[PDB]
Amino acid sequence: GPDDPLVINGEIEIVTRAPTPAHLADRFDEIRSGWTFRTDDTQALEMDDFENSGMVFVEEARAVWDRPEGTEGKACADCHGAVDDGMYGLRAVYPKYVESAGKVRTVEQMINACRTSRMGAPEWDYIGPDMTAMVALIASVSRGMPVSVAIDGPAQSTWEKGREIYYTRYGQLDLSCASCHEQYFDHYIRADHLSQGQINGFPSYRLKNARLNAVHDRFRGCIRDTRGVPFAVGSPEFVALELYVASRGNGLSVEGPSVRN
Amino acid sequence: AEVAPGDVAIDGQGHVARPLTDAPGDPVEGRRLMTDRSVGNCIACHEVTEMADAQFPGTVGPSLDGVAARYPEAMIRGILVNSKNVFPETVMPAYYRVEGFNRPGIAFTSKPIEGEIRPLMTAGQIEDVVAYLMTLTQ
Ligand code: HEC
Ligand code: HEC
Ligand code: HEC
């Protein structure tokens, strides 16, 4: 049900309903996890890690985190320690401004920057299985913690670019993210119960394709399905949009890997 | 003989009194076209109860039951030519437009349209669907 508590493994309280972030209070009263729009059976699959197929990949990523890889002969753990500490809280606050880049960067970009320039290892495909399993591991160790992406300071002009993309109609169907997710959340498009399009639960494990799904992969798909040309994965536009949509769920718990339709 | 997208006469309420084709519209075919996501994809947003076999109609748009008892033909066709002329800021796609899109792609391929944009629906297909919608007098 939409108002039932989400607790994972019995220990991890997920805040699935929260007061609207100030920048968005204008448009609705509550923000809600996409979990709260799913059926009972589907909601069930995220309440416990032994049933969340997305967590199989996380466990594989736990192994990779400790595997030396690249010419430096190092593994993530060698610089970051145990993942449950080195990544603690981290998914809550990306996308964020990274001083060394002078830009807002995504978790995926940071990972790949570590891979090529500190590990001497090939980059992982931005929305490929390796990267998405790893991003899901990183997410999973912050579940429970309120998403808290800065939307001002040096992030601000990215945030506003993301915000303008979110309210631009695309495609020959001429639709914006807000066309569906803001105006019409809680309605149905065909079989799909429309959520607010939060990303606090990414990477999402979807029953549709039985794999983890990265934020930029959903974005791409979403614009594609306006019968339009999506931006590139990793593009500055999707980086902008991701920061923005993230802030639309500020206050919601980190939830990933989540289970969705 | 069709009226091409750019040639449609549309009054100040968004209505189109003239059929887009001389081919009179086939109610039966119309029915079909509204369930095909490749073409109209209507029941993604609309219930039609008379389409008892419909199966999971959306609720984004109002139920189309009785739409022939509340709106005249020319307003219904207007809504299909360009819903925005009748319902400003509507999420309903414009089905006989070919300009002014923002990154339009070829179907759901993600690739840019190069060259003529074709309308989401041909004159025939719109006339077929309107013919149908006109049987929903309830
Ligand atoms: C030392 C040679 C490292 C290895 C091996 C890995 N990482 Fe790393 N990482 C390192 C530094 C010095 C920094 C800070 C970079 C900066 O510009 O300030 C990072 C940072 C990250 C981050 C950013 C998070 C943050 O604290 O702001 C992420 C998400 C990250 N690293 C991921 C990551 C992964 C997945 C790795 C294994 C493939 C990995 N790092 C290895 C140094 C090193
Ligand atoms: C209607 C044609 C849509 C438009 C335009 C956009 N989205 Fe969407 N989205 C749509 C459906 C029917 C669904 C599935 C049901 C649901 O809401 O959960 C979605 C889903 C998403 C999600 C997943 C949410 C989750 O909790 O896992 C995300 C992140 C999402 N959509 C993002 C998104 C963005 C950024 C869009 C603008 C480019 C956008 N969607 C447009 C339908 C539609
Ligand atoms: C969602 C993206 C839609 C799709 C796909 C279709 N329609 Fe629609 N329609 C939609 C909305 C949101 C509305 C109401 C106007 C508003 O935005 O406030 C409508 C309305 C109609 C109507 C008028 C009915 C009435 O007002 O009672 C008609 C006749 C209609 N729509 C027809 C129609 C057809 C034939 C479609 C398939 C090609 C179709 N709509 C798709 C949203 C959406």
Side-chain angles (χ1 to χ4, degrees), chain A residues 153-200:
Chain A
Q156 166 163 294
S157 62
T158 300
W159 182 78
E160 311 187 318
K161 186 182 180 183
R163 166 168 186 166
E164 176 195 43
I165 298 177
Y166 193 86
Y167 291 94
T168 297
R169 301 179 171 249
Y170 293 112
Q172 196 163 1
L173 302 181
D174 196 42
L175 290 165
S176 66
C177 312
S179 298
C180 292
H181 292 300
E182 184 170 294
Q183 297 191 54
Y184 286 112
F185 72 93
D186 253 333
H187 295 66
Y188 277 77
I189 296 200
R190 209 66 202 268
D192 293 311
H193 196 187
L194 265 188
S195 72
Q196 298 176 334
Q198 312 283 20
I199 58 173
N200 66 298

Side-chain angles (χ1 to χ4, degrees), chain A residues 184, chain B residues 34 40-42 45-46 60-62 64 67 70-71 79-80 87 90-93 95 121 129 133:
Chain A
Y184 286 112
Chain B
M34 288 176 67
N41 199 219
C42 317
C45 291
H46 288 287
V60 169
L64 293 191
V67 67
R70 50 167 175 290
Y71 305 153
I79 292 167
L80 289 173
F87 301 117
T90 182
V91 291
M92 186 168 151
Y95 283 97
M121 290 185 75
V129 167
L133 294 176

Side-chain angles (χ1 to χ4, degrees), chain A residues 55-67 76 83 124 129-138 212:
Chain A
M55 295 296 295
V56 173
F57 310 112
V58 172
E59 302 313 298
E60 305 190 317
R62 260 176 195 286
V64 176
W65 181 271
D66 299 308
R67 246 222 306 302
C76 316
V83 68
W124 284 326
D130 295 290
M131 174 64 78
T132 311
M134 182 58 83
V135 170
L137 166 61
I138 291 172
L212 294 174

Side-chain angles (χ1 to χ4, degrees), chain B residues 4 17 77-78 92 104 137:
Chain B
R77 172 181 301 103
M92 186 168 151
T137 53

